[PDB]
Amino acid sequence: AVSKVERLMNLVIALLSTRTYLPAEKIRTTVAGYADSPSDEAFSRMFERDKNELRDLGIPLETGRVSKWDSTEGYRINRDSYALPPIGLTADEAAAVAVATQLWQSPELVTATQNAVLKLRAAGVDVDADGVGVAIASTATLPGVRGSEEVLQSLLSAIDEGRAVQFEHRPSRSADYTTRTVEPWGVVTHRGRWYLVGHDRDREDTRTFRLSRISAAARPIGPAGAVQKPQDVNLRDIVRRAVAEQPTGERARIWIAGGRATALRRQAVTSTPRTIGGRAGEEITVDIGTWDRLAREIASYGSDAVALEPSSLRDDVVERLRAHAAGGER
Amino acid sequence: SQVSTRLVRLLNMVPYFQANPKVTRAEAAAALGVTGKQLDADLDQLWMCGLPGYSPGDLIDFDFVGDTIEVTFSAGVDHPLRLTSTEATGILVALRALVDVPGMVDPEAARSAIAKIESAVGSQRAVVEGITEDTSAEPGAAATVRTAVRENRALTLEYYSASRDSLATRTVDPIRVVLVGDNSYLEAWCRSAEAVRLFRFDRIVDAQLLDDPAAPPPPAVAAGPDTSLFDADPSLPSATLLIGAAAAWMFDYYPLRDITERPDGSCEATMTYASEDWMARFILGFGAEVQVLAPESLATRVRQAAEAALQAYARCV
Amino acid sequence: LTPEERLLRAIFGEKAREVRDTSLKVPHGESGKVIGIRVFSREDDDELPAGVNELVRVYVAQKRKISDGDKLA
DNA sequence: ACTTGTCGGTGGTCTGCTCTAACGTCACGGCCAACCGATCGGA
């Protein structure tokens, strides 16, 4: 009566400590736990199941002939591939790992992170989180990390397996869901926001999809290894280009009263004091960027911010203010 | 499964015990995150398994000195098991997500960790990658905040209050750093108002270090990690506003409540506001896209502000 | 291995490796000064006989003076 | 929840057996090449 864990430990120790390939019969006779098999077929099935389980854990078993003068095949575990190279971690790196190990919430991601941290600590370095004294408050309200957790896990699994992804994506809640089937290339984060990068098989273009919009139905399809993304493609550059398209728009002169509009004050490039209509302030020449965003920013401050140029922006602000002052009828 | 994880832990225990010559029971339990009985059972199971042939000088042997653990024969177990693809990918993703968060971790340390892990596992450019090779956007305030947190020293912060649209300089003692959503907030005790407030890194222009190592009151009274006294309270007024179909920008960046769908756009929602002026600015920003319904006083104030802005624009040139 | 040998190896810690010592030693009643070593390896494109991987020859030189028992004629 | 004895399938490798339909038909190769004595079987 030998437990399965003890049997697997004996098997892996025997494979690691033996410098020559071992056939099945020698393992049956020598390693404990394999001597209670009622029949040879039962032993073969048990050994195949145990070998499959060990191979699933990432242990690089190698199969080859026992000798150049013999035909029977044997088993051996390479010590070089089984052993990770040594790494030296400083206090800052240990603190970084300790802070990063307390982010995920899904059981699978938590288990994987715990196993990785355990292996890293067993490598020789020490990781401590109590010294830093930094915790996480929000655990179920994050729309980027907590909300996009299962989707990110599915995308990472598909990328590892090299398979295409089929999912439903909508540009906005007002719009309708659209089924999209693309070939994933990688995951790039920008300002703490995930952006899936891949090539669409329905439009034949490189698009970036925000993971918050994508639902949890990230079904992976296609044979493994069928995705071969070009190496010269820089995902970060594509994400940066997709984040912003207009470099600086145009130059607009805006007058703002002093002591307020600090958010707009920080965005000012050049400043010039000027008093108009008995109110002091400074005239600033700033960029345009998103026209709607600038119009909203100007209209939010009301009389605090007065637009001067261009005339189109002033007309738009005046129209919006008149619509607001109409009384809500329209 | 559970058995696979137990096997991995039992196989990796030996290198961990070899790394620390005299690791005690408490340190091992904390490192492995298991109870005392479970650790004892795992140690017993690992004790009686080793080299084939099964000789007492061949299998794994320990040396118990009181309540200490030491390895005398590793039986070929010299290095820990390698890292699988899933766990390495998760660690890299977590590190690259936390490197961009200001103040939670030093970017240099995160980059060094990423480089060392990639070198150890042999990853290539086909993995998750960041956006900026070198940020260089930190004004040095985050480093000062981290130093103040570590050394428990007085810190001066010039925080911009968005609700009141003003710059306030306060002297606070850092307590802890927490992450809420995608915006990390610094928790500290301010003697100016005698209350706990959360400050965001992007709203701090600069930080000044002072040599006043004074223990904050909350550690001596109450040091709850959350302390969300005003994050969500019934006393906060709520504004009911009509949102158009075109103005879909606010549906994601703000917590809209009581959302009702109407093809004609006759159904509205309700959102809380910290200050009346902030809500007025938020309403005026969208223009005609957002229509005010309730309360009547807020609508009257918005109309008066719009009329004043129109008069100011007419007077100005 | 005999139980006594296993016990001795366990006590002294010398691991029992499946290796047999076949070191070349100077034969009985011979000595001198090494003057030349020639090493042949298959990987260096050498016409070695099949099944042979390494072959090293060591030359030992000795000066013999006249002594009792040597034959003169 | 995890695991195992029992059941059945693929493909590869090593090993052995049976078959092939113009007509074919009794081997070179030869050492030995000494010398004396004793014994059994044909002429």
Numbering used by the authors:
A (entry chain X): 2 to 331
B (entry chain Y): 2 to 318
C (entry chain C): 805 to 877
What's the publication's text?
The DNA damage response in mycobacteria is controlled by the heterodimeric transcription factor PafBC, a member of the WYL domain–containing protein family. PafB and PafC each feature an N-terminal HTH domain, followed by the WYL domain and a WYL C-terminal extension (WCX) domain involved in heterodimer formation. Here, we demonstrate that the binding of single-stranded DNA (ssDNA) to the WYL domains of PafBC activates the transcription factor.
Cryo-EM single-particle analysis of the RNAP-PafBC transcription initiation complex, assembled without CarD, yielded a structure of full-length PafBC. The complex included RNAP, SigA, RbpA, and PafBC from M. smegmatis, along with dsDNA containing a PafBC-dependent promoter with a preformed transcription bubble, and an 11-nt-long ssDNA. In addition, we present a cryo-EM structure of full-length PafBC in its active conformation, bound to the transcription initiation complex, revealing the presence of ssDNA extending across the PafB and PafC WYL domains. PafBC inserts itself in between the promoter DNA and domain 4 of SigA, the domain usually contacting the −35 motif of housekeeping promoters. In the PafBC-bound transcription initiation complex, the HTH domain of PafB engages with the PafBC-specific −26 promoter motif, whereas the HTH domain of PafC interacts with SigA domain 4 (20). In the current structure, both HTH domains are accessible and interact with either the promoter dsDNA or the RNAP holoenzyme. The linker region likely plays an important role in transducing the signal of ssDNA binding, as the bound ssDNA stabilizes the linker in a specific conformation, potentially by constraining the distance between the two WYL domains. This, in turn, stabilizes PafBC in its active, pseudo-twofold symmetric conformation. PafBC formed a complex exclusively with RNAP-σA bound to PafBC-specific promoter DNA and only in the presence of the ssDNA ligand. Combined, these results support a model in which RNAP-σA scans along the DNA, halts at the PafBC promoter, and subsequently binds to PafBC that has been activated by ssDNA binding.
